Amino acid sequence: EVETFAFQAEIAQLMSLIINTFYSNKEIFLRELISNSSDALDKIRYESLTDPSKLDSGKELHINLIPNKQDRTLTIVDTGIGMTKADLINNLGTIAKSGTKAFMEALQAGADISMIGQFGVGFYSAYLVAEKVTVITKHNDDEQYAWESSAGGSFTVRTDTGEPMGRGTKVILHLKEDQTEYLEERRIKEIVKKHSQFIGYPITLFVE
Numbered sequence: 056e057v058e059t060f061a062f063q064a065e066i067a068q069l070m071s072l073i074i075n076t077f078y079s080n081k082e083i084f085l086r087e088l089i090s091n092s093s094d095a096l097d098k099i100r101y102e103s104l105t106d107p108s109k110l111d112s113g114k115e116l117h118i119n120l121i122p123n124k125q126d127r128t129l130t131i132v133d134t135g136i137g138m139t140k141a142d143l144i145n146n147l148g149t150i151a152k153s154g155t156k157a158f159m160e161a162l163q164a165g166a167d168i169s170m171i172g173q174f175g176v177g178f179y180s181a182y183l184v185a186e187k188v189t190v191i192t193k194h195n196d197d198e199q200y201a202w203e204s205s206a207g208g209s210f211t212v213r214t215d216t217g218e219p220m221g222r223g224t225k226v227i228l229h230l231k232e233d234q235t236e237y238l239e240e241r242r243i244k245e246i247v248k249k250h251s252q253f254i255g256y257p258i259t260l261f262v263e
């Protein structure tokens with residue numbers, strides 16, 4: 056059972072801007088996704104301080120970066136709070152309508168695409184390098200779901216039954232053919248060191 060949804064007009068507009076605007080500094084997508092993972096890990100950490108049972112679904116708080124050259128995918132995995140089906144559908148827990156408006160107003164006032172994260176819509180920078188994005192998530196209060204979108208104005212949501220993840224979110228980036236540099240170990244290391252060197256959770260770069 057696959058449900059298909061239309062993006063709200065402002066988000067479709069944001070995604071089209073990200074896909075069609077000439078902007079060479081695409082590497083910021085990884086900083087934005089690691090920042091989202093760090094925010095999700097802060098949330099489960101904070102909840103766990105008053106209710107330790109919130110960590111029954113996994114005590115380790117970390118981020119993994121998994122390149123796969125054969126599948127042309129870069130996966131970002133975290134053991135953060137995860138998202139309910141309701142929050143997945145509601146723009147992956149973001150204030151994407153108001154955030155898109157504020158980002159649009161900033162771009163007209165001198166901002167550049169790298170400042171996207173300041174407006175709470177950093178997730179959508181995945182579309183600088185991915186033709187398709189799959190988001191697998193598990194929140195303590197709901198079941199495991201898979202969100203997917205190749206942009207074009209719609210996304211799908213389905214229950215995910217293969218590979219239970221305990222708790223957290225997995226962002227699978229199906230890379231564009233000219234963006235395979237982001238599967239190279241030395242390139243990922245360089246971007247992590249440049250933009251995410253002080254993230255408060257261990258970041259493990261997997262090898263092949």
Ligand SMILES: O=C(c1ccc(O)cc1)c1cc(Cl)ccc1O
Binds near residue numbers: 093096138192224
């Ligand atoms: O699960 C979350 C999430 C949940 C709540 C939250 O406030 C922030 C991010 C998640 C969302 C994205 Cl899009 C990427 C990584 C993630 O860890």
